[PDB]
Design an enzyme around this catalytic site. Sequence first.
Site, PDB file in Angstrom:
ATOM      1  N   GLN A 239      12.836   4.366  -3.410  1.00 11.05           N
ATOM      2  CA  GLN A 239      13.254   3.210  -2.616  1.00 11.05           C
ATOM      3  C   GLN A 239      13.296   1.952  -3.458  1.00 11.05           C
ATOM      4  OE1 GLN A 239      12.452   2.834   1.658  1.00 11.05           O
ATOM      5  NE2 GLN A 239      10.740   4.242   1.231  1.00 11.05           N
TER       6      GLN A 239
ATOM      7  N   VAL B 196      10.130  -7.835  10.225  1.00 18.17           N
ATOM      8  CA  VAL B 196      11.261  -6.955  10.454  1.00 18.17           C
ATOM      9  C   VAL B 196      10.971  -6.114  11.701  1.00 18.17           C
ATOM     10  CG1 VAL B 196      12.703  -5.125   9.474  1.00 18.17           C
ATOM     11  CG2 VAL B 196      11.848  -6.936   7.982  1.00 18.17           C
TER      12      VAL B 196
ATOM     13  N   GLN C 239      -3.897 -12.305   7.967  1.00 26.04           N
ATOM     14  CA  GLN C 239      -3.926 -12.018   6.546  1.00 26.04           C
ATOM     15  C   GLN C 239      -3.203 -13.083   5.727  1.00 26.04           C
ATOM     16  OE1 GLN C 239      -3.481  -8.012   4.609  1.00 26.04           O
ATOM     17  NE2 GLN C 239      -1.352  -8.754   4.534  1.00 26.04           N
TER      18      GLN C 239
ATOM     19  N   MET D 182       0.819  -1.179   0.000  1.00 24.54           N
ATOM     20  CA  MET D 182       0.000   0.000   0.000  1.00 24.54           C
ATOM     21  C   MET D 182       0.871   1.253   0.000  1.00 24.54           C
ATOM     22  SD  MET D 182      -3.290  -0.935   2.169  1.00 24.54           S
ATOM     23  CE  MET D 182      -2.547  -1.245   3.687  1.00 24.54           C
ATOM     24  N   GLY D 183       2.102   1.121  -0.453  1.00 18.69           N
ATOM     25  CA  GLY D 183       3.050   2.233  -0.434  1.00 18.69           C
ATOM     26  C   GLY D 183       3.443   2.626   0.985  1.00 18.69           C
TER      27      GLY D 183
ATOM     28  N   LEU E 234       6.558   2.958   1.965  1.00 20.33           N
ATOM     29  CA  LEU E 234       7.441   1.794   2.181  1.00 20.33           C
ATOM     30  C   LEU E 234       8.473   2.006   3.278  1.00 20.33           C
ATOM     31  CD1 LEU E 234       7.949   1.087  -1.620  1.00 20.33           C
ATOM     32  CD2 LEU E 234       6.176   0.087  -0.099  1.00 20.33           C
ATOM     33  N   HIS E 235       8.632   0.996   4.123  1.00 19.93           N
ATOM     34  CA  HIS E 235       9.709   0.942   5.109  1.00 19.93           C
ATOM     35  C   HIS E 235      10.522  -0.351   4.980  1.00 19.93           C
ATOM     36  CE1 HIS E 235       7.137  -1.753   7.401  1.00 19.93           C
ATOM     37  NE2 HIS E 235       6.198  -0.827   7.473  1.00 19.93           N
TER      38      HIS E 235
ATOM     39  N   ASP F 216       8.839   9.149  -3.268  1.00 18.99           N
ATOM     40  CA  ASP F 216       9.749   8.512  -2.315  1.00 18.99           C
ATOM     41  C   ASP F 216       9.714   6.980  -2.385  1.00 18.99           C
ATOM     42  OD1 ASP F 216      11.633   8.408  -0.071  1.00 18.99           O
ATOM     43  OD2 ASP F 216       9.908   7.730   1.113  1.00 18.99           O
ATOM     44  N   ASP F 217       8.509   6.419  -2.480  1.00 15.92           N
ATOM     45  CA  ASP F 217       8.348   4.973  -2.625  1.00 15.92           C
ATOM     46  C   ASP F 217       9.118   4.473  -3.835  1.00 15.92           C
ATOM     47  OD1 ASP F 217       6.777   4.836  -0.361  1.00 15.92           O
ATOM     48  OD2 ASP F 217       4.862   4.753  -1.460  1.00 15.92           O
TER      49      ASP F 217
ATOM     50  N   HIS G 280       8.757  -3.655   4.251  1.00 14.94           N
ATOM     51  CA  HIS G 280       8.456  -3.885   2.829  1.00 14.94           C
ATOM     52  C   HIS G 280       9.689  -4.263   2.010  1.00 14.94           C
ATOM     53  CE1 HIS G 280       5.466  -0.887   4.338  1.00 14.94           C
ATOM     54  NE2 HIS G 280       4.672  -1.887   4.001  1.00 14.94           N
TER      55      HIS G 280
ATOM     56  N   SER H 190       6.243  -0.715  11.511  1.00 16.64           N
ATOM     57  CA  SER H 190       4.926  -0.360  11.038  1.00 16.64           C
ATOM     58  C   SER H 190       4.898   1.134  10.806  1.00 16.64           C
ATOM     59  CB  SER H 190       3.866  -0.768  12.083  1.00 16.64           C
ATOM     60  OG  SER H 190       2.610  -0.180  11.790  1.00 16.64           O
ATOM     61  N   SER H 191       4.189   1.565   9.759  1.00 21.20           N
ATOM     62  CA  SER H 191       4.060   3.003   9.505  1.00 21.20           C
ATOM     63  C   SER H 191       3.388   3.705  10.701  1.00 21.20           C
ATOM     64  CB  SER H 191       3.293   3.258   8.198  1.00 21.20           C
ATOM     65  OG  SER H 191       2.061   2.548   8.198  1.00 21.20           O
ATOM     66  N   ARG H 192       2.569   2.964  11.441  1.00 20.45           N
ATOM     67  CA  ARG H 192       1.824   3.507  12.602  1.00 20.45           C
ATOM     68  C   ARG H 192       2.692   3.856  13.808  1.00 20.45           C
ATOM     69  NH1 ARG H 192      -3.514  -0.443  13.062  1.00 20.45           N
ATOM     70  NH2 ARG H 192      -4.120  -0.378  10.843  1.00 20.45           N
TER      71      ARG H 192
ATOM     72  N   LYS I 113       4.020 -10.439   9.844  1.00 14.75           N
ATOM     73  CA  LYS I 113       3.456  -9.498  10.844  1.00 14.75           C
ATOM     74  C   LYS I 113       1.936  -9.511  10.790  1.00 14.75           C
ATOM     75  CE  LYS I 113       2.986  -5.103  10.463  1.00 14.75           C
ATOM     76  NZ  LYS I 113       3.261  -3.662  10.194  1.00 14.75           N
TER      77      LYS I 113
HETATM   78  N1  LIG Z   1       7.542  -5.133   9.874  1.00 17.86           N
HETATM   79  C1  LIG Z   1       7.231  -5.878   8.810  1.00 17.86           C
HETATM   80  N2  LIG Z   1       7.943  -6.989   8.539  1.00 17.86           N
HETATM   81  C2  LIG Z   1       7.646  -7.775   7.493  1.00 17.86           C
HETATM   82  N3  LIG Z   1       6.628  -7.492   6.678  1.00 17.86           N
HETATM   83  C3  LIG Z   1       5.878  -6.384   6.895  1.00 17.86           C
HETATM   84  C4  LIG Z   1       6.156  -5.541   7.981  1.00 17.86           C
HETATM   85  N4  LIG Z   1       5.264  -4.534   7.974  1.00 17.86           N
HETATM   86  C5  LIG Z   1       4.462  -4.740   6.921  1.00 17.86           C
HETATM   87  N5  LIG Z   1       4.844  -5.853   6.264  1.00 17.86           N
HETATM   88  C6  LIG Z   1       4.177  -6.430   5.079  1.00 17.86           C
HETATM   89  O1  LIG Z   1       4.052  -5.394   4.115  1.00 17.86           O
HETATM   90  C7  LIG Z   1       2.830  -5.662   3.334  1.00 17.86           C
HETATM   91  C8  LIG Z   1       1.976  -4.338   3.313  1.00 17.86           C
HETATM   92  S1  LIG Z   1       0.469  -4.529   2.285  1.00 17.86           S
HETATM   93  C9  LIG Z   1       2.156  -6.881   4.013  1.00 17.86           C
HETATM   94  O2  LIG Z   1       2.629  -8.130   3.450  1.00 17.86           O
HETATM   95  C10 LIG Z   1       2.700  -6.716   5.429  1.00 17.86           C
HETATM   96  O3  LIG Z   1       2.537  -7.914   6.191  1.00 17.86           O
END
Ligand SMILES: Nc1ncnc2c1ncn2[C@@H]1O[C@H](CS)[C@@H](O)[C@H]1O
EC number: 6.3.2.1
Lengths: 275, 287
Positions: free
Chosen positions: A79, A174, A151, A39-40, A42-43, A75-76, A46, A183-185, A147
Amino acid sequence: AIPAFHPGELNVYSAPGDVADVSRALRLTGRRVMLVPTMGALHEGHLALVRAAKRVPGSVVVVSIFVNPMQTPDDDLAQLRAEGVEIAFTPTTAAMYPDGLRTTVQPGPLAAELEGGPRPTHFAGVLTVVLKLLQIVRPDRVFFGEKDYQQLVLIRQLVADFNLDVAVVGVPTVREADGLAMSSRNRYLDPAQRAAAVALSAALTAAAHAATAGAQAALDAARAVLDAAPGVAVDYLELRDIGLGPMPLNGSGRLLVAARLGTTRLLDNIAIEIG
Amino acid sequence: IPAFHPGELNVYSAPGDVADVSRALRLTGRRVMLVPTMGALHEGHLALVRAAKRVPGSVVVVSIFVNPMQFGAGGDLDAYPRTPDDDLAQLRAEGVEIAFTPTTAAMYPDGLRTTVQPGPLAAELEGGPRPTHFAGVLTVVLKLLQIVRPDRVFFGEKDYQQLVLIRQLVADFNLDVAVVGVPTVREADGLAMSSRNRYLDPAQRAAAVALSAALTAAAHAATAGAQAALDAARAVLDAAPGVAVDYLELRDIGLGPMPLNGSGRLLVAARLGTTRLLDNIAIEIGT
Ligand SMILES: Nc1ncnc2c1ncn2[C@@H]1O[C@H](CS)[C@@H](O)[C@H]1O
Ligand SMILES: Nc1ncnc2c1ncn2[C@@H]1O[C@H](CS)[C@@H](O)[C@H]1O
């Protein structure tokens, strides 16, 4: 005529038909197409999916970026370029849903549990968009992070149930230096909340090691760690088998947790071996 | 890859087997055609096979599977005609090279878990009293499409609403397959071919011509407008001994949230005793 594809460069496509034609053409040339749905924003989490995709011999990596309404672009893309990714698929909502919401995927009952508690239609949205991306891109393998374990399990059920010809690859979570799942959060957390948020991963790892003393010891150890954190509202803490059915008496399982810190909801999970 | 003998009928029950053979064929340049059926084959099905066969370089896969998920209890599932010896004989006579005859266990090893949820059209017409019927149909067709991965998939116009919903499935899930609708095959008097026609006694068989008579009357009446077309059909159905009409509806060709313009489809469903019969026809208004 096949759309232009420049090898070794980041090729960005917004039309589903365009990425479909390039993907088909590339597979005929002897590439193995890898899909990494995102979903963009990116960290490193991803990027770990991207790196897993890249190391498959013959790989060409497709990263989709799409904010699915049913569940920094520049930016995405930078990367992705830095990672040597050759295809970015960046469709609009209109391109993905030209007829609006019509035919959809209905998940099995697992979708109503755990994360499906507060968000009872979230996973229908996820499986619908994932099924579409699989059909557009037709990858040999598709990559998801552990994570979001529930899902990942539901996608495995989608693949089995609809006889999809793609291998689903789960990629380990990760983590930041203290264990917190990336997490972006996380950036929304104030200092006190960020310090308290370490309890999720600490609880899970404590449980994984406590598990030599049995399932109850593992669960109790995790609850204790979460009980030592202020302002961490536990939504659930559940031990299940690896397919998220009931935990067997012995053998492999998964422990999952979710909690609210202020307005920020965090999730984590870990492999557990009982005894 | 299990054995494939070309120019002969090869029967596979395992989804893995047909998937392997199909993939192997596509990789050598053959174009795979799929004709999904529930068996009890008649000339209407054979028209689908023949349409598939004429695609240059085609290899034809006919699936035969009485799909439990598109039936509701009791009742109907056990009552569906099964004539597998005749079916395979007919496919041999038509020079079909692959029959796919999966078991219920192989198709539904986990029962009903992930399923397809059709759009609002599945709640209407045939779906009204049978609200889960088309979710069953779309789920099995999706699975068959994934197993066989054909270039083209063939459906009859007789079950027009089903054909429309399959096109929706294909569009909405971005499936890389062309849907080919094949015109309804009819008996000499007009009766649409159906495996259910075997349940009409001689009197009911005679009466059943009213469905196709009503539709064709309406198609010709349509120069005078929609009301004329519908009233012509109603008049014929009304003059028919022991035909009980369930619905008679004139819709836009996609059957969707759009008003009738110059091109429509007239659809009918009626009971003759316990046998429910369907038919439909293209309608042009003022044309
Ligand atoms: N910290 C993390 N480590 C590994 N995968 C991650 C993550 N944070 C998000 N993802 C992975 O990125 C995707 C976003 S749609 C999804 O497959 C999520 O599980
Ligand atoms: N009389 C007929 N003419 C053409 N196709 C027919 C038919 N009767 C049934 N079919 C077609 O055969 C298939 C059985 S699952 C389905 O696509 C139906 O529309």
